[PDB]
Symmetry: C2
Subunit: 275 residues, 2 copies
């Protein structure tokens, strides 16, 4: 069964509740991470917890626990789940923004759920993305505000995921780092504009190992007709091929050879970053 | 009276009200709300606020969890229990799931009742400062719970009262307020194609129509501020709050102006007409 660690206890997820006074509810003041397991070990646990502290600090939220305490809770919850686990620690604003311009009464909780990988057919056929003219503000911060990822899909035509394409510059997915492949090169937005993805970081290391050139610039929507391949990355989805962006088919409209090769190398290599 | 929360069919003490962590308002910021205030313990613009709430929900793919008649019933019953000037905030949550049908079909709702806290009389006397930012509210007709930018954007606000959304130097609105500029004795305010349909905004345009004061529904430009006489922001609690500084730019003579004070007086004299 799914779990939530809150107020010092592991509860059944469905029993865990938060006071309506919390500014995560009232004003969307919250940050979080998604951590996933392979062989019941958390992948890039330390990078994820460093990113969470980064998100909190950048949002003027005082950490309500040490990273060592959060790692302790995360390991104990994975052990209790006894399966491959998706873990989501949340840090809330809590009830007040002080005279000192900090959230000093932050609450936190940690969700544990059995991992749900995208369906194997989505790796075989790839997915469609819906481009929007919008950006994530303070893009290095992973806040809980994913409203546009849902609302901005009243007319997404069954797309898997939103693509933030401010003024036609591709930055990233609502849940994913975006990679374009052009002439055998990787193109991905720089971390000035895109979240510093853990999967992103591993793919750049794999590209270095493979002597695959990476350009850290925003691919343009206007470059898509000349791309060979595209994929999106995240700890759960791994490398997921993108065969359509809006009305634009990417290359031949099926997952490409460099995407499949990089996904195979990822799966073979991720032991190195298991904690 | 103590603060209340209506949730799961009961009025609780606010401090006892809790929401499941499974709710996507918590996990993903899927939430919309309104702020309703009282004059003489009667709700101001209750129907326009509830229609705006349904607008917000519908535009966010959230299936309303109660009828507007039921929400109105709850709001009136809570005001009666408070027996004082009340700020009322109904919230509509995403609930636990986004369906294969691209809707939030298990929305929750709750309603907070709190004693009204007006800005300090000194802020009406001296006016306030706004901090301009190069950003916009996406889905601007929708009032969502996402106010993170209003808080984080105060590392460098220089003590501003409120952030002002000034995408590409075009003034749209505050994080919590409608923005009005005064030039040559008339009103400039962003159109509702770009700004929230403020209930205070709507009343101010009707008062302008009655007073034969010209309203231009265009985004005032940061570059026009040196030529403005006055500015103010509006919201159901703050009423008309003078703005004497935007960024490093002083507005007019740097004190509240005569058309702002006149419109605030007519507002307060006339307010009964929009009570329900
Ligand atoms: C805005 C955004 N960009 C990029 C990423 C990719 O980051 P990483 O490679 O560190 O996972 C995420 C992860 N979004 C997730 C997890 C999705 C996944 O694991 O595939 C989320 O919680 O939505 C994200 O939310
Ligand atoms: C973005 C925004 N703009 C304007 C307003 C003012 O609307 P009203 O006059 O209905 O309070 C609010 C309400 N706090 C708001 O959140």
């Amino acid at each position: 069964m799914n779990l939530c660690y809150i107020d010092g206890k592991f509860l059944p997820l469905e029993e865990a509740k938060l006071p309506v006074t919390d500014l995560i509810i009232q004003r969307g003041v919250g940050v979080f991470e998604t951590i996933s397991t392979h062989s019941r070990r958390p992948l890039m646990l330390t990078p994820h917890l460093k990113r969470l502290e980064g998100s909190a600090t950048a949002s003027s939220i005082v950490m309500p626990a040490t990273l060592d305490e959060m790692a302790r809770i995360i390991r104990e919850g994975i052990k209790k789940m006894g399966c491959e686990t998706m873990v989501r620690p949340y840090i809330t604003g809590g009830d007040s923004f002080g005279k000192d311009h900090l959230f000093s009464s932050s609450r936190y909780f940690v969700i544990f759920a059995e991992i749900r990988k995208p369906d194997p057919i989505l790796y075989e056929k790839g997915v469609a993305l819906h481009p929007i003219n919008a950006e994530r503000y303070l893009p290095s911060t992973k806040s809980i505000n994913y409203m546009l990822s849902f609302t901005g899909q009243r007319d997404s035509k069954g797309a898997y995921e939103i693509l933030y394409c401010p003024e036609g510059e591709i930055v990233e997915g609502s849940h994913s780092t975006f990679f374009l492949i052009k002439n055998g090169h990787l193109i991905t937005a720089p971390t000035s504009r895109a979240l510093s993805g853990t999967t992103r970081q591993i793919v750049l290391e794999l590209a270095r190992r493979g002597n695959i050139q990476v350009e850290e610039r925003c691919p343009l929507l206007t470059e898509l007709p000349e791309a060979e391949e595209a994929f999106i990355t995240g700890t759960v989805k791994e490398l997921l091929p993108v065969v359509r962006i809006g009305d634009q088919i990417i290359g031949n409209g099926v997952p490409g050879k460099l995407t499949k090769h990089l996904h195979q190398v990822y799966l073979s290599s991720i032991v190195e970053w298991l904690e």
